[PDB]
Amino acid sequence: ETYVTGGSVAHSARGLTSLFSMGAKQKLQLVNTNGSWHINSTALNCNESINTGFIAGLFYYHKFNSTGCPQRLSSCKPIISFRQGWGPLTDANITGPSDDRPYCWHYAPRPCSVVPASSVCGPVYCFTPSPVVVGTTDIKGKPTYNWGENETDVFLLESLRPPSGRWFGCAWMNSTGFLKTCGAPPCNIYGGNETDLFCPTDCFRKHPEATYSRCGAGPWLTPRCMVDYPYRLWHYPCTVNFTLFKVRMFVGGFEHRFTAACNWTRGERCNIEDRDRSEQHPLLHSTTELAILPCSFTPMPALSTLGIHLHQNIVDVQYLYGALKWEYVVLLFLLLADARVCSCLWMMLLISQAEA
Amino acid sequence: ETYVTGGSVAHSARGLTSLFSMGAKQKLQLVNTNGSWHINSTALNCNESINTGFIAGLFYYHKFNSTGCPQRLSSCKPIISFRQGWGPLTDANITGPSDDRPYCWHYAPRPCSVVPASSVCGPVYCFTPSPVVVGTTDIKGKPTYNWGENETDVFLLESLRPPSGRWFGCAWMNSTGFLKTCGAPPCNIYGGNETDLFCPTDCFRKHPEATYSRCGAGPWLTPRCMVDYPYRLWHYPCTVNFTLFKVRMFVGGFEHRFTAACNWTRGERCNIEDRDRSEQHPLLHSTTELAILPCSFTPMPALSTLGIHLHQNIVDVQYLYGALKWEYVVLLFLLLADARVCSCLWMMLLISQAEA
Ligand SMILES: *[C@@H]1O[C@H](CO)[C@@H](O[C@@H]2O[C@H](CO)[C@@H](O[C@@H]3O[C@H](CO)[C@@H](O)[C@H](O)[C@@H]3O)[C@H](O)[C@H]2NC(C)=O)[C@H](O)[C@H]1NC(C)=O
Ligand SMILES: *[C@@H]1O[C@H](CO)[C@@H](O[C@@H]2O[C@H](CO)[C@@H](O[C@@H]3O[C@H](CO)[C@@H](O)[C@H](O)[C@@H]3O)[C@H](O)[C@H]2NC(C)=O)[C@H](O)[C@H]1NC(C)=O
Ligand SMILES: *[C@@H]1O[C@H](CO)[C@@H](O[C@@H]2O[C@H](CO)[C@@H](O[C@@H]3O[C@H](CO)[C@@H](O)[C@H](O)[C@@H]3O)[C@H](O)[C@H]2NC(C)=O)[C@H](O)[C@H]1NC(C)=O
Ligand SMILES: *[C@@H]1O[C@H](CO)[C@@H](O[C@@H]2O[C@H](CO)[C@@H](O[C@@H]3O[C@H](CO)[C@@H](O)[C@H](O)[C@@H]3O)[C@H](O)[C@H]2NC(C)=O)[C@H](O)[C@H]1NC(C)=O
Ligand SMILES: *[C@@H]1O[C@H](CO)[C@@H](O[C@@H]2O[C@H](CO)[C@@H](O[C@@H]3O[C@H](CO)[C@@H](O)[C@H](O)[C@@H]3O)[C@H](O)[C@H]2NC(C)=O)[C@H](O)[C@H]1NC(C)=O
Ligand SMILES: *[C@@H]1O[C@H](CO)[C@@H](O[C@@H]2O[C@H](CO)[C@@H](O[C@@H]3O[C@H](CO)[C@@H](O)[C@H](O)[C@@H]3O)[C@H](O)[C@H]2NC(C)=O)[C@H](O)[C@H]1NC(C)=O
Ligand SMILES: *[C@@H]1O[C@H](CO)[C@@H](O[C@@H]2O[C@H](CO)[C@@H](O)[C@H](O)[C@H]2NC(C)=O)[C@H](O)[C@H]1NC(C)=O
Ligand SMILES: *[C@@H]1O[C@H](CO)[C@@H](O[C@@H]2O[C@H](CO)[C@@H](O)[C@H](O)[C@H]2NC(C)=O)[C@H](O)[C@H]1NC(C)=O
Ligand SMILES: *[C@@H]1O[C@H](CO)[C@@H](O[C@@H]2O[C@H](CO)[C@@H](O)[C@H](O)[C@H]2NC(C)=O)[C@H](O)[C@H]1NC(C)=O
Ligand SMILES: *[C@@H]1O[C@H](CO)[C@@H](O[C@@H]2O[C@H](CO)[C@@H](O)[C@H](O)[C@H]2NC(C)=O)[C@H](O)[C@H]1NC(C)=O
Ligand SMILES: *[C@@H]1O[C@H](CO)[C@@H](O[C@@H]2O[C@H](CO)[C@@H](O)[C@H](O)[C@H]2NC(C)=O)[C@H](O)[C@H]1NC(C)=O
């Protein structure tokens, strides 16, 4: 039976919180719009503070009328559906209309340019692996000079890859409540019935070295897991059901720690092919057990030896705790032979190779 | 007394190797040239194979006539000599003549462009943290079109930062016998008697977040240490006295392991200010002892707590092996009070914060 150990779930992180007792009055529910399913932005208070939004997200665990969520998610595809990849990576060129629904894990965004705050509701979140909030500054002052009309305090992101730039990608909702995100260019894996995946994240199974650091640009680490943040339920509705995990990234030399949610349910077939690469780092750095994303692994070989050791029935666990007898025997035989010159040569060879 | 433990030295990695008995006949020594000190390219066989050059480097431990080395090194400067840095990084733009001697650790190179092989001797080495050799391919065929005249098989590097590109920087020695190197653009740390350091490496002490991954482009990790490779003496002569160490980088998500040498002698004052940031990772991943670069550290905090623990006398060591009694006592007092609602609230708070 496939299950987890360290999986923390926030579906009922509440008790006797009936002081509000009803959605804290900012009802969050999906509606259809000419065959399109987004959040009902009408009631959906917009100009709140960070603490008010934090309380609102705190009270949202149960009242989710997830009715149209399946048919909305029908647009998304599993990683299997795409075609193979090969060759050296290239940087894609996202242009023209993007008919794809952005909430899918594999949505290629446009480069993060300027954006007027007159058409955004809620905070805007950039996703240097540890999520961050982005503020504003008045457009009327700077020569940015009126992308719209009498607007003020436009957001600007304009970031390169986080090792050089500031963040991978950022997300928000526009005024009508539709998800809108941008990010760094993703990886094309073909230039050098199915569809060509543009790999906005760690598409390990479809391309070997397309790691998150090189390719990923956005909230998605694996096609199964994502980085959590206070407005995660805000921006992405359907991912309510997810379970949290502890993550240590270590991107760009610096250290990054945060939480991650996942498309995980007990009993999912996860034999060997449903494993995705993700660069983790030890949290406690001991006990030889690593809490890793479910249906995943990390490229850190074990202590004594190499070869990733993973448990059949629990996927979140990464195992550790899985010598030159020949050379020592040869050296001892040489010593018995008393060939000191040969003994000295063997000692030098061991120092160069065995000892080094 | 300041000394090391894991420091391996290859100054006498030899014994009874007198078959050649003289430098394998390609005697290597420095000479002056109009006030400039480069290698004796005259004798200096050029068209050797990898194995022949490897044997040559194997036999080069003792016959190094270190006469002009000090006055040649007089051009280099210690990290103290430069000025402070601040603000967000920028990418510098190296143009025009570069009068600085490239062998200094702090030499800013030009972008790695094409280069005709008719003016290079020996292998060319690109320094993706684990050093690699670069081959050639005929210039006459492709759209390169004859940089010189009737030349063939020119080198091309044209790489971005290794997370996106292929290597940080590459080096070689040009036909007349002078070091020639290129690399990714370095970090300017001021745009956003002493001189302005352009930071081609991990200039941690002069700029806090100028890590190697963001800034470094070339063989130098620290102003004290440098990644080793077979033709290290071939390119940099004066660095013979260096001592080797093991290094685990973890660059761009992938894993890198190689050897590093350092400007280290016993007795160097290394109290607290002579420590340079460098990202290592555990080799054996146990025993709580890390063999790191001397006079350095690593942003990988200890197991139980944080705070880099470093021994006063031996520098190569990084120490590991340096709880909510308050909350537990509060919860237990609440339980004794039998305030179940308060007890439930405390349990939820602990789950949200203490347990998470
Ligand atoms: C979390 O994981 C579950 C499990 O994969 C996801 O449910 C899956 O959603 C897809 C998309 O609609 C379903 O595929 C579709 O099935 C219909 C009906 O067979 C078919 O007509 C479509 O062509 C498409 O193949 C899939 O059946 C469904 N699987 C299960 C077990 O429910 C869910 O969407 C994921 N949610 C998130 C937020 O990641
Ligand atoms: C918030 O984002 C949504 C998602 O894109 C926006 O909806 C889209 O809005 C554009 C223009 O506002 C619509 O384009 C117009 O519609 C026709 C329909 O064929 C299209 O062909 C033309 O290009 C025309 O310009 C687009 O259809 C519409 N799509 C959906 C699914 O609603 C919405 O306008 C954004 N609102 C704000 C305030 O930013
Ligand atoms: C996240 O997990 C919860 C826990 O089960 C899911 O809630 C359950 O979802 C199913 C699917 O719609 C509900 O079944 C339907 O219920 C309605 C109303 O009772 C009924 O009219 C339908 O015929 C069908 O039986 C189920 O009631 C519901 N249970 C609870 C306690 O909410 C939830 O659906 C999961 N998230 C997503 C996006 O699926
Ligand atoms: C390895 O480390 C040693 C120790 O720093 C380096 O030796 C140092 O080299 C510099 C450069 O010439 C010397 O500074 C110069 O000193 C002269 C004489 O005082 C002065 O006139 C110059 O203006 C300049 O300040 C420094 O004294 C010298 N220190 C020692 C202890 O020898 C050596 O160059 C390093 N080698 C490599 C390959 O890294
Ligand atoms: C191999 O690399 C060395 C190191 O740069 C080259 O030596 C340099 O060569 C240039 C032109 O060949 C010399 O520039 C010339 O010298 C005067 C001196 O005032 C300079 O003002 C002019 O710009 C003139 O072009 C440069 O002085 C010289 N420097 C040294 C230290 O030797 C060498 O030419 C390269 N060899 C090949 C075959 O590419
Ligand atoms: C690497 O370490 C070796 C070991 O000490 C250094 O070799 C020594 O270098 C000193 C400095 O030049 C030599 O002293 C000089 O020796 C010459 C010839 O004997 C003498 O005429 C001078 O008056 C002065 O005393 C010393 O002899 C030499 N020892 C050996 C065994 O080679 C070497 O210099 C170091 N590397 C560098 C680049 O400095
Ligand atoms: C969840 O939202 C759906 C949206 O369709 C609700 O379905 C509608 O419910 C009303 C009354 O409850 C009916 O008059 C409509 O005909 C329903 N729509 C359809 C398409 O059948 C559903 O009731 C909501 N459920 C909850 C628990 O809020
Ligand atoms: C482990 O070995 C098996 C056979 O020993 C390999 O092939 C799998 O065999 C099972 C048994 O029928 C199939 O259900 C799987 O579909 C096979 N794998 C594939 C990729 O087709 C395989 O080397 C290993 N098993 C798996 C599941 O990969
Ligand atoms: C180092 O370079 C010098 C050039 O100044 C070489 O000196 C000449 O080398 C040639 C070739 O062996 C001889 O024919 C000349 O007689 C040498 N002249 C002098 C004044 O030395 C020297 O041989 C080189 N050393 C090497 C290659 O080991
Ligand atoms: C190391 O190189 C220096 C070159 O400066 C050699 O010193 C020269 O020796 C010659 C004769 O042997 C004389 O012209 C001078 O004594 C030096 N020339 C200078 C200083 O310009 C030195 O002999 C070499 N060492 C060894 C061991 O060969
Ligand atoms: C260790 O603490 C000392 C004082 O408690 C700090 O200042 C150093 O004090 C010594 C004693 O005279 C001086 O020699 C050093 O020059 C002082 N440091 C500096 C940077 O000037 C300091 O926090 C620590 N020591 C050092 C060398 O940094």
Automatic annotation (TrEMBL), chains A, B:
Question: What transmembrane ranges does the database entry give?
Answer: 328-349
The organism named in the record is Recombinant Hepatitis C virus S52/JFH1
The role this protein plays is: RNA-dependent RNA polymerase that performs primer-template recognition and RNA synthesis during viral replication. Initiates RNA transcription/replication at a flavin adenine dinucleotide (FAD), resulting in a 5'- FAD cap on viral RNAs. In this way, recognition of viral 5' RNA by host pattern recognition receptors can be bypassed, thereby evading activation of antiviral pathways.
Cysteine pairs bridged by disulfides in the record: 46-121, 69-238, 76-104, 112-182, 126-170, 187-215, 199-203, 225-262
Intracellular or extracellular location(s): Host cell membrane; Host cytoplasm, Host perinuclear region; Host endoplasmic reticulum membrane; Host lipid droplet
Indicate the family of this protein. Answer: Belongs to the hepacivirus polyprotein family.
Name the record gives this protein = Genome polyprotein
What interactions and quaternary structure are annotated?
Answer: Homohexamer. Homoheptamer. Interacts with protease NS2.
